[PDB]
């Protein structure tokens, strides 16, 4: 018994067989893939469907008169609809992009050009944001003149409900609030609805890159204005992301990028724009990445996405339990049920890169060491550290095809690393 | 005998076998794919390599933290080298993007943000430009205040050497010149060396999206400042493009997009940027797309790119001469050896969309009708037309896997339309 409360040994066994990378061995040990927070492994049946699409159903899309162009166009718009149903949005509220990062850049630039984010307006973000939801705001404040303010994290990197309510006293009327739906370092799932009510007049953006892959997201319930995520973190193709926005807001936004398809009329001197969603898709999109993403979502819904979520939840609880028992590790983030997907940590007396190196070479375990694209968060964690804090951490992250046994290999690995450095 | 002065019947038939779409039949007719100028068919061996990458050598990149991460990093970066070598560029001068369109948008925003293209300045483009190399200039000139000027086309859409000189009399020192390498409507390969020598102090950008797939481009010899093209038009994956820029210029440009990997140091208040080329690659790129495009380049080089080029030339000249024989069609563009790849035309008394539909439903022939994302050029061609010009054209376009027989099926379909429908 694989030790699941969610999947039978047969269903689960079938799932694992969908991921050929799991048959890889590193120095004679099976691959134990715990770097899911950076990117995920690919499903053979999904990738075969993309291959069939490239080889037999492919051409450029829209203005479709010939047979392949119709097929490709229909498949692409069908993919948009699968994504809209997955988020409870309408299809004209789904814009295909290159990724989360592009999505955030699209918003900052489009909000400023549309006249919504002005000089001396304030954008409020959190201290635990990924560079993708931090650097565009901080750098572009120098060109457009807005100010950036932060919701502060505690010395373990936690954004408490109290911090959220306290920030509102101090920054009462932010023009934009952009926050992570879940930290790629602390593992903390954020209280999005509490944020939405506390900053009732703000344009609210959620960085969904870590959240969307393992937890149900209903954009109407959350009442977010915009949400972004990346395909490659949900078993999907690279080069494909999603931007969701409220139809009423998208209708007033200046396009980020310009070119073909997004126009209606072009003259040498002026342009007008197409309707939604095409207004915000300039030139040839990642047609096959979109179709592939659609097929990824079909795969997840065939397993059943509530089961995906529960399985990841039980893996997360087990990972965090086992990590908390080790007396020679320091763990970051909340020790509560908001903590999901991943555990960032340091082994006392051992450099993070050595932890990841030995885990990989001697135990076949893939983890990541470093700042995890959250350099300012590291400075916050340093203040609460009780060790000689290396300004970086090790990170183990779980997803669909992981097991409790994978986690037991990680633990065995870490014990070994402690005994080896003494 | 397949009528090639370039490939033996043996080699040619192996090349055809690489493209499974060619086995498709439309109402009993074999696919005759002549919409290459929109996008190209995919090679099975290439797509199998991409499949092997996705399933067995996949992870996020640029940090040597575990075995699959290193593999994936090496593969992506060797793909960057393959592109650099194909264009005779250094690898730090090659930036992966989502396509040609994102590439132009990058340049316009970055040139403005960097203080290079200012309110006083003029960008010179041509009247034949695709929307990708027209709309961003026109629309952003309204936010940034620079001026847009145009090299004029004659009434068949031809950009003559004399028109280029005449523009130089009125606009002797444009800050930026952005010009097509080859028009997607007239097929005219532009005289890039002439343009480079005539505007020697401008920042010269070439939109190579139609050109690069079938003609050797040596960026050092041409001495262009920037060049852009799209993967999907050179047998490659969707969602992937290339931007080439001279190292000395890339080093002074503000990045277009911000996020992970493109930074060096991030604080809550300031950022610094990574080295070339990563300065201009924000967040996770289309990893597998880049690898695929490398393998596409390998494939073209195993055939022999000079042979590809000569095959497309021989096909282009046959297409144009057979179209010139037909007294019921109006042909656009120059009737000389500058005309390559594609022929835009109208059938007298028949709407372009009906031509395309009849060709597809009766002859298996894929063509495109519409404005081809060049609406201002349509207005230019309207004045030279001798028929009731429908503000659109039919276009047939040839590439590697096409044959003189394919072109003969097109011609037969056009005569069927004339003879019977009528
Ligand atoms: C991965 C991630 C991003 C950036 O995604 P890309 O796909 O690399 O553009 C942003 N935010 C969070 C929280 C992430 O985990
Ligand atoms: C196709 C094309 C473009 C746009 O390419 P995308 O891949 O759609 O970004 C730009 N210029 C010309 C001349 C083209 O043929």
Q: Is B306 exposed, middle or buried (0-12, 13-18, 19+ CB in 10 A)?
A: exposed
Assign B272 to helix, strand or coil.
strand
Question: Which backbone phi and psi does B73 adopt, to 5 degrees?
Answer: -60, -50
Distance between CA atoms of B155 and B330, rounded to whole angstroms?
13
Residues 6+ positions from A115 with CB-CB distance below 8 Å: none
Q: Report which DSSP code applies to B37.
A: T
Question: Which backbone phi and psi does A33 adopt, to 5 degrees?
Answer: -95, 105
Distance between CA atoms of B202 and B200, rounded to whole angstroms?
6
CA A116 to chain centre: 26
Could you tell me which of A369, A138, A183, A97 has the C-alpha nearest to residue B285?
Answer: A97
Q: Name the residue among B41, B240, B370 with its Cβ closest to that of A63.
A: B370
Which residues on adjacent β-strands are paired with residue B180? B207
Q: Experimental technique used?
A: X-ray
Distance between CA atoms of A311 and A296, rounded to whole angstroms?
18
User: Which pair of structure tokens corresponds to residue B248?
Assistant: 């000395």
Q: Is B138 exposed, middle or buried (0-12, 13-18, 19+ CB in 10 A)?
A: buried
Could you tell me which of A108, A103, A129, A85 has the C-alpha nearest to residue A242?
Answer: A103
Q: Name the residue among A31, A47, A289 with its Cβ closest to that of B238.
A: A289
Distance between CA atoms of B170 and B176, rounded to whole angstroms?
15
Q: Report which DSSP code applies to B23.
A: G
Smallest-distance ligand from the CA of A189: 1
Q: Quick count: other Cβ atoms within 10 Å of Cβ B147?
A: 16
Residues 6+ positions from B265 with CB-CB distance below 8 Å: A375, B271, B272
How many angstroms separate the Cα of A18 from the Cα of each of A32, A222, B152?
15, 33, 57
Distance between CA atoms of A342 and A320, rounded to whole angstroms?
8
Distance between CA atoms of B262 and B280, rounded to whole angstroms?
6
Report whether B387 contacts B346 (CB < 8 A). Answer: yes
- Is A140 near chain B, with CB under 8 Å? yes
Distance between CA atoms of A414 and A32, rounded to whole angstroms?
14
B257 contacts A288? CB cut-off 8 A: no
Distance between CA atoms of A225 and B66, rounded to whole angstroms?
38
Residues 6+ positions from B142 with CB-CB distance below 8 Å: none
Q: Which three-class secondary structure string do you get for chain A?
A: CCCCCCCCHHHHHHHHHCCHHHHCEECCEECEECECCCCCCCCHHHHHHHHHHHHHCCCCCCCCCCHHHHHHHHHHHHHHHHHHHHHCCCHHHEEEECCHHHHHHHHHHHHHHCCCCCCCCEEEEECCCCHHHCHHHHHHHHHHCCEEEEECCCCCCCCCHHHHHHHHHHCCCCCEEEEECECCCCCEECCHHHHHHHCCCCEEEEECCCCCCCCCCCHHHHCCCEEEEEHHHHCCCCCCEEEEECHHHHCCCCCCCCCCCCEEEECCCCEEECCCCHHHCCCCCCHHHHHHHHHHHHHHHHHCHHHHHHHHHHHHHHHHHHHHCCCCEEECCCCCCCECCEEEEEECCCCHHHHHHHHHHHHCEECEEECCCCHHHHHHHHHHCCCCCCCCEEEEECCCCCCHHHHHHHHHHHHHHHHHHC
CA A323 to chain centre: 23
User: Which pair of structure tokens corresponds to residue B11?
Assistant: 């080699």
Token look-up 């690995």 returns A413
Could you tell me which of A49, A174, A21 has the C-alpha nearest to residue B57?
Answer: A21
Resolution in Å equals: 2.1
B72 lines ligand 2 (CB under 6 A): no
Could you tell me which of A256, A236, A242, A240 has the C-alpha nearest to residue A207?
Answer: A242
Q: After which residues is chain B broken (C to N over 2.5 A)?
A: none
Report whether A363 contacts A420 (CB < 8 A). Answer: no
Token look-up 């807005």 returns A146
User: Which pair of structure tokens corresponds to residue B203?
Assistant: 């920042």
- The span from the first CA to the last CA of chain A, in angstroms, equals 35
Distance between CA atoms of A180 and A207, rounded to whole angstroms?
4
Q: Whose CA is nearest to atom 12 of ligand 1?
A: A209
Distance between CA atoms of B226 and B250, rounded to whole angstroms?
9
Assign B387 to helix, strand or coil.
coil
User: Which pair of structure tokens corresponds to residue B219?
Assistant: 């960026």
Q: How far is B54 from chain A (nearest CA, A)?
A: 6
Handedness of CA B72, B78, B83, B84 (dihedral sign): positive
CA B321 to chain centre: 24
Q: Which residue out of A40, A97, A184 has the highest number of ligand 1 atoms within 8 Å of its CB and is therefore the one to mutate?
A: A184
Report whether A69 contacts B38 (CB < 8 A). Answer: yes
Question: Which backbone phi and psi does A106 adopt, to 5 degrees?
Answer: -55, -45
Task: Delineate the domains of chain A, giving CATH numbers in brackets.
Answer: 1-36+304-422 (no CATH), 43-303 (3.40.640.10)
How far does the centroid of ligand 2 lie from the alpha carbon of residue B232, in Å?
10
Could you tell me which of A132, A151, A140, A276 has the C-alpha nearest to residue A202?
Answer: A151
Distance between CA atoms of B117 and A249, rounded to whole angstroms?
31
Could you tell me which of A239, A222, A5 has the C-alpha nearest to residue B96?
Answer: A239
Assign B201 to helix, strand or coil.
coil
Question: Which backbone phi and psi does B225 adopt, to 5 degrees?
Answer: -80, -40
Token look-up 């951490």 returns A393
Looking at ligand 2, which atom is closest to the CA of residue B103? 9
Q: Is B256 exposed, middle or buried (0-12, 13-18, 19+ CB in 10 A)?
A: buried
Question: Which backbone phi and psi does A45 adopt, to 5 degrees?
Answer: -70, -35
Could you tell me which of B261, B256, B236 has the C-alpha nearest to residue B108?
Answer: B256
Scanning B314-343 for CB atoms below 8 A from A yields: none
Q: Which residue out of A185, A192, A209 has the highest number of ligand 1 atoms within 8 Å of its CB and is therefore the one to mutate?
A: A209
Could you tell me which of A96, A6, A49, A36 has the C-alpha nearest to residue A299?
Answer: A49
How many angstroms separate the Cα of A352 from the Cα of each of A37, A409, B92, B324?
17, 18, 30, 70
Token look-up 């393992």 returns A214
Could you tell me which of B296, B318, B303, B291 has the C-alpha nearest to residue B213?
Answer: B296
- Known active-site residue B373: yes
Question: Which backbone phi and psi does A248 adopt, to 5 degrees?
Answer: -60, -30
B231 lines ligand 2 (CB under 6 A): no
Could you tell me which of B394, B393, B396 has the C-alpha nearest to residue B319?
Answer: B396
Report whether A244 contacts A217 (CB < 8 A). Answer: no
Which residues on adjacent β-strands are paired with residue A388? none
Q: What is the DSSP string of B47-105?
A: HHHHHHHHHHS----SS--SHHHHHHHHHHHHHHHHHHHHHT--GGGEEEES-HHHHHH
Looking at ligand 1, which atom is closest to the CA of residue A129? 13
Assign B338 to helix, strand or coil.
coil
Token look-up 């037909």 returns B326
B232 contacts A98? CB cut-off 8 A: no
Report whether A106 contacts A256 (CB < 8 A). Answer: yes
Report whether A125 contacts A150 (CB < 8 A). Answer: yes
């Amino acid at each position: 018994h694989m030790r699941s409360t969610v999947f039978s040994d047969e269903e689960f066994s079938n799932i694992l067989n969908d991921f050929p990378a799991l048959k890889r061995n590193i120095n004679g040990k099976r691959l134990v893939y715990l770097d899911n927070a950076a990117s995920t492994l690919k499903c053979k049946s999904v990738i075969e469907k993309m291959t069939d699409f490239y080889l037999y159903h492919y051409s450029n899309i829209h203005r479709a008169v010939h047979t392949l162009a119709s097929e490709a166009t229909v498949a692409y718009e069908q993919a948009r609809e699968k994504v809209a149903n997955f988020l409870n949005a309408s299809s004209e509220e789904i814009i295909f992009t290159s990724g989360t990062t592009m999505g955030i850049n699209f918003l900052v630039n489009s909000l400023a050009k549309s006249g919504i984010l002005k000089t001396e307006d304030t954008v409020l973000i959190s201290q635990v944001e990924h560079h993708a939801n931090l650097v565009p705001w901080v750098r572009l404040s120098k060109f457009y003149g807005f100010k950036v303010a932060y919701i502060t994290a505690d010395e373990k990197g936690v954004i408490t409900n109290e911090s959220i309510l306290k920030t509102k006293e101090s920054i009462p009327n932010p023009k934009v609030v952009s926050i992570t739906g879940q930290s790629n370092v602390t593992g903390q799932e954020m209280p999005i609805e509490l944020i939405r009510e506390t900053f009732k007049n703000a344009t609210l953006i959620v960085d969904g890159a870590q959240l969307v892959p393992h937890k149900k997201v209903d954009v109407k319930k959350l009442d977010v204005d915009f949400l972004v995520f990346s395909g490659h973190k949900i078993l999907g193709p690279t080069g494909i992301g999603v931007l969701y926005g409220k139809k009423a807001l998208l209708e007033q936004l200046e396009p980020f990028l310009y070119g073909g398809e997004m126009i209606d009329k072009v003259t040498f001197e002026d342009v007008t724009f197409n309707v939604l969603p095409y207004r915000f898709e300039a030139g040839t999109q990642h047609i096959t990445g979109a179709v592939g993403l659609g097929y990824t979502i079909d795969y997840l819904e065939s397993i059943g996405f509530e089961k995906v979520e529960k399985h990841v939840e039980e893996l997360s609880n087990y990972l965090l339990e086992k990590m908390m028992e080790l007396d020679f590790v320091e763990v970051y983030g909340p020790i509560d049920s908001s903590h999901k997907s991943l555990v960032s940590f340091n082994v006392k007396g051992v450099h993070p890169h050595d932890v990841s190196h030995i885990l990989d070479e001697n135990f076949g375990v893939a983890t990541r060491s470093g700042h995890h694209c959250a350099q300012p968060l590291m400075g916050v964690l340093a203040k609460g550290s009780k060790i000689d804090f290396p300004n970086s951490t090790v990170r183990a992250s779980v997803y669909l095809y992981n097991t409790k046994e994978d986690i037991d290999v990680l633990i065995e690995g870490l014990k070994y690393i402690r005994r080896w450095f003494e």
